[PDB]
Amino acid sequence: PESADLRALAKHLYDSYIKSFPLTKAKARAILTGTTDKSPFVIYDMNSLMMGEDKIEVAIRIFQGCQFRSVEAVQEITEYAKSIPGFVNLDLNDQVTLLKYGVHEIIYTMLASLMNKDGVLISEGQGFMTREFLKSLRKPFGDFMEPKFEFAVKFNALELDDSDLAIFIAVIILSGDRPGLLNVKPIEDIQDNLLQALELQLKLNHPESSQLFAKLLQKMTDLRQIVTEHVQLLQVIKKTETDMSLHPLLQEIYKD
Numbered sequence: 591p592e593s594a595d596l597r598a599l600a601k602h603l604y605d606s607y608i609k610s611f612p613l614t615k616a617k618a619r620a621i622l623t624g625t626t627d628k629s630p631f632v633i634y635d636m637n638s639l640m641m642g643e644d645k646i647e648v649a650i651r652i653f654q655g656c657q658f659r660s661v662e663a664v665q666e667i668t669e670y671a672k673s674i675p676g677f678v679n680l681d682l683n684d685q686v687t688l689l690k691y692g693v694h695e696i697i698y699t700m701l702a703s704l705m706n707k708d709g710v711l712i713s714e715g716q717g718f719m720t721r722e723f724l725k726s727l728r729k730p731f732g733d734f735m736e737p738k739f740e741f742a743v744k745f746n747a748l749e750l751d752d753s754d755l756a757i758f759i760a761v762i763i764l765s766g767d768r769p770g771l772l773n774v775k776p777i778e779d780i781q782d783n784l785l786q787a788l789e790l791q792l793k794l795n796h797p798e799s800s801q802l803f804a805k806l807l808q809k810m811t812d813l814r815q816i817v818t819e820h821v822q823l824l825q826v827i828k829k830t831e832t833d834m835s836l837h838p839l840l841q842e843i844y845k846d
């Protein structure tokens with residue numbers, strides 16, 4: 591049967607995901623819901639902030655923090671992409687294009703794994719910065735993360751685990767609707783059996799979660815929105831802070 595072929599694919603992607611991302615959702619949840627060995631230091635104010643620097647501008651200093659981290663995620667995501675069957679065999683220009691557009695959608699999908707209603711894990715889970723402390727930041731920085739939490743709280747309500755996420759982030763990267771794609775066909779063919787792999791995976795892994803597959807695909811809309819707001823807000827910074835530098839890798843990704 592072909593089902594056997596789809597599980598092998600599901601398994602392969604899961605193995606690669608674990609190899610590419612150091613902080614999985616399983617670990618993240620273990621830390622958030624916990625355990626005495628995985629307990630994080632919590633940052634909820636400026637004092638605990640300067641206290642946190644030990645154990646582990648202001649709004650700008652953390653903004654650069656996210657920047658460096660996002661660059662790391664891009665690297666990890668790029669490494670995972672190469673493992674998707676057929677990906678590296680596609681035209682180079684498109685490989686670059688698929689990455690340029692899928693990286694941020696994937697970053698916010700996985701960032702949810704490190705979030706709960708109250709805040710978000712940092713420094714590979716050694717810390718936990720409160721949602722409120724982030725919202726208290728001088729504008730426009732103060733409202734950089736709120737849209738992520740709102741998305742996270744509802745995305746997390748689907749109760750997906752890592753083996754599920756591995757296939758879904760792969761489906762995201764292999765999107766034949768990306769601006770500027772040279773050969774949409776071979777890309778669509780790959781996503782086709784990836785979606786087939788996802789459908790079966792959700793059915794077996796969540797036998798009683800009616801239409802999770804359809805529900806999860808609709809979430810691909812919420813991600814689009816998030817990216818846009820982030821980009822607009824980003825344009826504001828570059829003008830209000832002509833003295834703050836932005837990483838090249840991230841600048842080339844935003845030409846959009």
Ligand SMILES: CC/C=C\C/C=C\C/C=C\C/C=C\C/C=C\C=C\[C@@H](O)CCC(=O)O
Nearest residue numbers: 652653654655656657659660701712713840
């Ligand atoms: C030690 C890091 C301190 C705080 C981290 C808190 C949140 C960051 C968590 C994940 C990073 C993902 C997105 C960061 C949010 C906005 C990023 C602003 C830019 O700069 C870089 C983001 C980008 O454009 O990719």
